[PDB]
Design a protein around this nucleic acid. Structure first.
Ligand code: ZN
Ligand code: ZN
Length: 53
DNA sequence: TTAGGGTTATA
DNA sequence: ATATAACCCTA
């Protein structure tokens, strides 16, 4: 099943949502806050976090 | 707030 | 079909 995660029982409705979900198992955090240096998994998370500054 | 589930739009 | 994006919801 191309919609099933190879690392857990999660099954996505769309292929793009499975690819996003894979990042929970790799731990990759490609986004950062320029003010405090904290790392984030999505760029929407940075915008959400920016409100503390 | 954090973080990952959901969704829809555009190319 | 993929790539990137954005916005909402919730524990
Ligand atoms: Zn998984
Ligand atoms: Zn910060």
């Amino acid at each position: 099943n191309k919609l099933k995660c190879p690392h857990c029982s999660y099954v996505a409705k769309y292929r793009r949502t499975l690819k996003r979900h894979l990042l929970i198992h790799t731990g990759v955090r490609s986004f950062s806050c320029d003010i405090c240096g904290k790392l984030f998994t999505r760029r929407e998370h940075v915008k959400q976090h920016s409100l503390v500054h």
